[model samples]
Target: GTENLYFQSMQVAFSFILDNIVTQKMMAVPDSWPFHHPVNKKFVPDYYKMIVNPVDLETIRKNISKHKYQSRESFLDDVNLILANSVKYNGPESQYTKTAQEIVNICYQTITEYDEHLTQLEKDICTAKEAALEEAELE
Candidate 1:
């Protein structure tokens, strides 16, 4: 009975095989992928061309103290700049453009989610340090 069921499944699969093959063959036709076969090879940039700016946590804390609310627009602007620059220098045709674009997008996402968290963390540290100072003064 199990073998019969298997054969029945195989028959159904076989029946669809031609349809699947035709569909795949049609899809396999190159759909104008950017930079699939770059003509000017010299224009292609190295994958590592995108550089991540170093996060200065201490500087961030000091800056946040000066500014009441960190503008979410600022980080988004940085992301846009990165993408724009990548497009200008590397272009969508280059391998670096796609990877760098993804990185910039992710950075924008992470900064939006984490900036508040980061601010809270700095505040907590400052509060703890103040409490320690008060205890020392009492002693």
Candidate 2:
């Protein structure tokens, strides 16, 4: 369900997903995410060449705190970035792929709920504005 958002709910929805249990726990395992800090430029020198958009929770978290996130799309893109990169780098049978997909699915479920919440928010805003305009017309 694609609906125009009111902009206010972006932070609310982003916070909702960022603090999710699956998300926090997913990256907690060092065995799964050895390089939580960008896979280290030296640890995997060629990694960046293959990856167009790197996904690091630490960097992402920092960005979030910087108040740079403006919409819900990036919230979902965060999950896709991690999953897509892991799958492409690690391939079909890699543990990273499996583990990432497990938590990513959970994240998607919550993210989709945020989209629905956005739709609900937009609907309410439309109605509220309609009421305000109607009342103003009679005055």
Candidate 3:
């Protein structure tokens, strides 16, 4: 299915970044995540932290490996989390952050195309079924 293929591509891209950059370079981890207003000073509780230490990178990798996201929103939520952390710790100038953003944008474009393809397929299926019924009536 195109959906499955799209998601697999996202996972593969994410894994490549993790292997080649995030892990290999020993990038900094964010002090906190899911921040509130006055962003520099306030953050969500420790229990809600998504990226606290370098070790959490492994956890993120494992979670991505295990979960098969069924919708674009769900998948993007994880991708956004990854991006937020990468940017927060590495700053926007880091090559790793830029690569991650580019990969995420590519995934998003694939998802948009896949959704349009599905819509066309649905329309075609309905048209085909209607034609088949008309042929049966004529017979």
Candidate 4:
């Protein structure tokens, strides 16, 4: 049950990235751009496999379920790796590069913001506790 949910969520997230981020932006790029390699017609298949590969997905799910990822930055690192591998064989200037870079940037920004928020909360908590201790000592 949990595996299915994870897979579904993964599928949805990738679909959103492909459609909203990649496809929409690629509408303006010329048709001749090597989005798909001329010799290898398996670009789309490889892209899907990044998420659909059972072994990879299970590893990701385990990392998530066991909290193996040390932080959001580490999680984003894994995401960047996946994006890099997805289009490794495609043209250097392919639309995939542009889209993947944008996605990676978004992920980096989101995780950085979240980490900053958590750091601020930690500071606030420590400050409150120290103040409480100081007041108790005064009493």
Model 1, span 34-114: residue lDDT tens: 322222334533433443332122322333344322334543453355446557666877665665455455544555555
Q: Return the candidate ranking by TM-score, descending.
A: 2, 3, 4, 1
Mark the regions of model 4 whose C-alpha exceeds 4 Å error after superposition: 1-62, 118-139
Clash totals, every prediction: 0, 0, 0, 0
How far is 20's C-alpha from truth in model 4 (Å)?
Answer: 17
Estimate the TM-score for candidate 4.
0.39
Give the per-residue lDDT of model 4 (tens digit) for 11-125.
3443333233223332223441332222232645665544432212234444555544433444556556544654564445767666555555665554454566545544544
Candidate 2 vs candidate 4: the TM-score winner is 2
RMSD of every prediction: 21.8, 7.2, 12.0, 12.6
Best by lDDT: 2
RMSD of 4: 12.6
Q: Each candidate's lDDT (Cα)?
A: 0.41, 0.61, 0.48, 0.45
- The best candidate by TM-score is 2
Instruction: Give the higher-TM-score candidate: 1 or 2.
Output: 2
Superposition error at 102 for model 1 (Å): 1.5
Worst lDDT window (10 residues) for model 2? 1-10
As for candidate 1, its clashing pairs are: none
Which of candidates 1 and 4 is the stronger one according to TM-score?
4
Q: Model 1, which residues run further than 4 Å from truth?
A: 1-69, 115-139
* Off by more than 4 A, model 3: 1-68, 117-139
lDDT of 3 at 68: 39
TM-score of 1: 0.32
- Alpha carbon deviation, residue 3, candidate 4 (Å): 28
